[PDB]
Amino acid sequence: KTRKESYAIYVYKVLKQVHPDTGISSKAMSIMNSFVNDVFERIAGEASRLAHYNKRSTITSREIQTAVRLLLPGELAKHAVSEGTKAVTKYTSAK
Amino acid sequence: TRKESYAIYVYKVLKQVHPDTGISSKAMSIMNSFVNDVFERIAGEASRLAHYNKRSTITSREIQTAVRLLLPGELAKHAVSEGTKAVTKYTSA
Amino acid sequence: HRYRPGTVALREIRRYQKSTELLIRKLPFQRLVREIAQDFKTDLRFQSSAVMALQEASEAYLVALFEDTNLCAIHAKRVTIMPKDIQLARRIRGERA
Amino acid sequence: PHRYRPGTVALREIRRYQKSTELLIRKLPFQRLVREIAQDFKTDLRFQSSAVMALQEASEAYLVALFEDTNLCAIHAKRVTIMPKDIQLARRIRGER
Amino acid sequence: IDVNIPLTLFEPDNYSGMITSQEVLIYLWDNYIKYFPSVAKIAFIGIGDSYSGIVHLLGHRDTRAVTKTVINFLGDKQLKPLVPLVDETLSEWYFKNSLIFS
Amino acid sequence: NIQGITKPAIRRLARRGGVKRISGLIYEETRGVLKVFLENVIRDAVTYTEHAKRKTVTAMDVVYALKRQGRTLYGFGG
Amino acid sequence: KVLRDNIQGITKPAIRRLARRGGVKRISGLIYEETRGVLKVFLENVIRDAVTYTEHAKRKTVTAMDVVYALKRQGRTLYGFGG
Amino acid sequence: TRSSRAGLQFPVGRVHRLLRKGNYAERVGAGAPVYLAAVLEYLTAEILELAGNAARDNKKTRIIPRHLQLAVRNDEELNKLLGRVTIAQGGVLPNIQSVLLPK
Amino acid sequence: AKTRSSRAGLQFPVGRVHRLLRKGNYAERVGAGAPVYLAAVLEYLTAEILELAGNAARDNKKTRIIPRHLQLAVRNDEELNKLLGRVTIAQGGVLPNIQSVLLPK
DNA sequence: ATCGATGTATATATCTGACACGTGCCTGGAGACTAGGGAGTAATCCCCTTGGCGGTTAAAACGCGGGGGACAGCGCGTACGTGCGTTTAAGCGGTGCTAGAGCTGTCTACGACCAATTGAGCGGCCTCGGCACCGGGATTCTGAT
DNA sequence: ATCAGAATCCCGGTGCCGAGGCCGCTCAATTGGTCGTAGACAGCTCTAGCACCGCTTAAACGCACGTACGCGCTGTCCCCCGCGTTTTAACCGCCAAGGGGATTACTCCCTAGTCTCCAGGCACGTGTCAGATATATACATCGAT
């Protein structure tokens, strides 16, 4: 018995954001869970390498900013700089 | 300061093969980059293995397996053989 | 009436790239995979979705190779193919030397 | 007036350039060039000369790699001569956009 | 081949007899038997003492490229287990084809 | 088996693959390269399973064998 | 302040010599610009990453290490430069 | 929480535990799960928006992964981006050339 | 003899390797003989490379090795040209790979 | 057939800086000891896997005919190698300056770490409707003339 | 243009099965709170990037000639398309059987933690030989008549 975690409800409600009344199969959801894990692994691996490159022990939102403008082509990357620095000020809003 | 390289142990295995041979510093850079490369591929591959197997430390079984997964035939063969030779030679006595 | 070459060829390109569907008789290919799977290991139960993943790998990789083979034929000013198109195609994949 | 048949002493120099290891891009053009490209993102940074030599080695490596692929495309194209369609075919085989 | 072992005196476990059994076992396999090319189907038969030298032929040397199954009439002597050193697969092979009687 | 895959299935994959008229040594060369493909995949998947101390090769292993050379299938055992 | 006509410094005979190391017998006249254009599409895909390293590093000098780290992520890893 | 206070959809506790577990550096500045969650949430909004547009093209109301591969081949940043990754049940698209069409 | 490597007859420092395994965020804890086995594979492949590097400098009559020899030593061995095809050596140099159809006749 | 020029290889001597070594000083490596958690093992479950049966049922096989696709032959058309004289700017090196790299030193913010309570996230549950099934009639080409 | 003949589409009924939803469980998040050190942050030095200049020359450019490689045309022969006829084994539903991993509770050795000790290993200094460079000589091949 395993109550095994995935990215179901979050990608579910992001689909409820961008397309407010639609459906999806479980197979395509498994593709999407795979896709979230893949991008999680590549940004996290570049964060690992850049943290070892900068001779230091920690990784902040700054490091994710420079990691994504190394990763994506710079239009999508700089749109993610907008969503990320949005999230910087909106998580330093509260605790 | 210190500078942790591997140039003298490369000189050791170099002289084990031949006393007749001069490395360059750029060939040492190629060789050290090869060390750091193969270091981190195998080291991340063992970390991948321990992530798949959900443990804390690493047995040399994992190094054996990852050498068989990465390296082709004679390479993985002789490397598994030299590795279990070293497992015997240290871990025995 | 007897059609020229190309008619049901173009019509079946339009038919098979419409459908979302599998194309291969399954158990001949499973006979192929267990004929490989005997070779180095024994007492081998298996799981079915691994065979489905090997199905997706084989069908996607080979419709991709027919696409490369098609574009080497497009380069070759021809419509009927050669195996040497596949040989050049997987050299410039870099999958083959 | 003695005059060679075409391309053969060129192949003698193909044996010359495939007996060697060197760079051929000269240093001040590539220096001015990479200062023009790094100019286009955020201006006036100081560099390493080893950075310039690293980008120059990667440049000539990927060049002579794709020159040998374009030569194999002209061989499969039943030709002695190359075209830009060999290059364009090589980009859509390699998946370049 | 027969090898007698002279015992150790006034002692619970015949220990230096085990020491010279590792000297005998490692010397025979690392001096002449790999240089016997025409060899297959070796069995080791230990009577009483000094099983740990043949345990030391198993867990410290690949003698099982030629030998097949070890025999021990232990009886009253102390247990000499195979330590898992390169793996516990050779100890599992030990656990499948060996004999010890106590 | 080795010839359980037939010529018309290869032509159906050619017609989804955009190929319009087809040669004949193609079919046997295709069966050989497909069997090379499957042998390298099941080589390293069986190597993962012998590390796993299991007697069932999972689709996890097959995705990891794709993950050797950057050919990752989404959806079936990441 | 931008620089100009540096890709004109890549002349037609230099690309011709590198294609002679590339084994090529006969050399078409239709070629030489697109190569250079692909070369532009080469370095546009490089340093779009690379300065994002040293902007993070708060350095006003650019290393070869950033070049090496970029060619790791571009998959064009070369030795002879270390680290 | 740490997540609704941040205003995202992607949970900072989960991601923080997995970055703790995932061995990258020693310590963690806590904007990094938040900024990582922001980029991950924006790119899955990209994929689901183009996938819903490709599902609008074919009107299977549950998205078959045909639509996902259509959403790959529409967006050339995504087609240029995910160029090594396969999709099951994704299908293909027609491409018939001047040498291939009847003259 | 301070070293753990002479206990196994190696040449590469398992204290240093065990240090960078402990201080590298690869795994959480690092075992004893898995770095020994890793240093053994490292020591074998550097002996195997410098074998053929000495061969390629040997037929090219060189001692202080230029990496032309190294490019021959990787690229000729199709276990290792397979395994290390991803990386070009700086000042590598290319092979004579000349097809017959462009050769004269 | 003999002749030439271009490239490759070789023979020489010569000088340099990189390598290769030697020198000396320390920090990280070694040792010794502990404690804790990692890991390893066995006992029951039940789930998952293999296996096999018989009936239709389309797909595979096999065959046939000629056109168009392959291939070869010829002739045309043209651009690129080859050779020489002219021009442009990279390379060389030599001097000087400071920005920023790098090194240092303290303080405190920021993250770790612990404990106590709570809902975020999943399994298990059922039902329903999106979609597969289809039978008929509207059109939309292909090839022949 | 003019034809059938295929191939393609759209509709009403049935029918079914995977999403999707809610139920409830639980364990990791959250919160509350403290502690210490990495790292923030400022100071200092000392590297190396930039610049400039003038002597050299390697590379780039241009022309004249023509040759031999691309390609367009024709013409055929056999390999695919279409279509007719014969055989397999894929699939569904049914039961039967057993392998092994999950889960559970248990213990112990090993690796980490800590401390203290000391030479391995480092930078620094130094001297030298493989290698590059420059000059003389013979050998191969391509090509023109």
Swiss-Prot record, chain C:
Keywords: Acetylation, ADP-ribosylation, Chromosome, Citrullination, DNA-binding, Hydroxylation, Lipoprotein, Methylation, Nucleosome core, Nucleus, Palmitate, Phosphoprotein, Ubl conjugation. The modification N6-crotonyllysine is found at residue 18. A lipid is attached at residue 72 (S-palmitoyl cysteine). It comes from the Eukaryota. The modification N6-(2-hydroxyisobutyryl)lysine is found at residues 18, 26, 41, 84. The keyword Cytoplasm does not apply. The modification N6,N6,N6-trimethyllysine is found at residues 18, 41. The modification N6-succinyllysine is found at residues 18, 41, 84. The modification N6-acetyllysine is found at residues 18, 41, 77, 84. It comes from Xenopus laevis (African clawed frog). The modification Phosphothreonine is found at residues 42, 69. Its main location: nucleus. GO terms for molecular function: DNA binding; protein heterodimerization activity; structural constituent of chromatin. The modification Phosphoserine is found at residues 19, 48. The modification N6,N6-dimethyllysine is found at residue 41. The modification N6-glutaryllysine is found at residues 18, 41, 77, 84. The modification N6-methyllysine is found at residues 18, 26, 41, 84. GO terms for cellular component: nucleoplasm; nucleosome. The chain holds residues 40 to 136 of 136 of the full protein. Acetylation is generally linked to gene activation. Acetylation at Lys-84 (H3K122ac) by EP300/p300 plays a central role in chromatin structure: localizes at the surface of the histone octamer and stimulates transcription, possibly by promoting nucleosome instability. H3R2me2a is present at the 3' of genes regardless of their transcription state and is enriched on inactive promoters, while it is absent on active promoters. The modification N6-lactoyllysine is found at residues 18, 41. It is found in: Nucleus; Chromosome. The modification Phosphotyrosine is found at residue 3. The keyword Nucleus applies. This is Histone H3.2.
Curated annotation (Swiss-Prot), chain E:
Signal peptide: none annotated. It is found in: Nucleus. Responsible for the deacetylation of lysine residues on the N-terminal part of the core histones (H2A, H2B, H3 and H4). Histone deacetylation gives a tag for epigenetic repression and plays an important role in transcriptional regulation, cell cycle progression and developmental events. Histone deacetylases act via the formation of large multiprotein complexes. Present with 3050 molecules/cell in log phase SD medium. Belongs to the histone deacetylase family. HD type 2 subfamily. This is Histone deacetylase HDA1. It comes from Saccharomyces cerevisiae (strain ATCC 204508 / S288c) (Baker's yeast). The gene is HDA1. The chain holds residues 549 to 650 of 706 of the full protein.
Curated annotation (Swiss-Prot), chain G:
The modification N6-methyllysine is found at residue 1. It is found in: Nucleus; Chromosome. The modification Phosphotyrosine is found at residues 32, 69. There is a cross-link at residue 12 (Glycyl lysine isopeptide (Lys-Gly) (interchain with G-Cter in UFM1)). Demethylation is performed by JMJD6. GO terms for cellular component: nucleosome; nucleus. The modification N6-butyryllysine is found at residues 12, 25, 58, 60, 72. The modification N6-(2-hydroxyisobutyryl)lysine is found at residues 12, 25, 40, 58, 60, 72. This is Histone H4. It comes from Xenopus laevis (African clawed frog).
UniProtKB/Swiss-Prot annotation, chain I:
Following DNA double-strand breaks (DSBs), it is ubiquitinated through 'Lys-63' linkage of ubiquitin moieties, leading to the recruitment of repair proteins to sites of DNA damage. H2AK119Ub and ionizing radiation-induced 'Lys-63'-linked ubiquitination are distinct events. The modification N6-glutaryllysine is found at residues 82, 105. Keywords: Acetylation, Chromosome, DNA-binding, Hydroxylation, Isopeptide bond, Methylation, Nucleosome core, Nucleus, Phosphoprotein, Ubl conjugation. There is a cross-link at residue 2 (Glycyl lysine isopeptide (Lys-Gly) (interchain with G-Cter in ubiquitin)). GO terms for biological process: heterochromatin formation. The modification N6-(2-hydroxyisobutyryl)lysine is found at residues 23, 61-62, 82, 105. One of its GO terms (cellular component) is nucleosome. It is found in: Nucleus; Chromosome. The modification N6-succinyllysine is found at residue 82. GO terms for molecular function: DNA binding; protein heterodimerization activity; structural constituent of chromatin. The modification N5-methylglutamine is found at residue 91. Core component of nucleosome. Nucleosomes wrap and compact DNA into chromatin, limiting DNA accessibility to the cellular machineries which require DNA as a template. Histones thereby play a central role in transcription regulation, DNA repair, DNA replication and chromosomal stability. DNA accessibility is regulated via a complex set of post-translational modifications of histones, also called histone code, and nucleosome remodeling. Belongs to the histone H2A family. This is Histone H2A type 1. The chain holds residues 15 to 119 of 130 of the full protein.
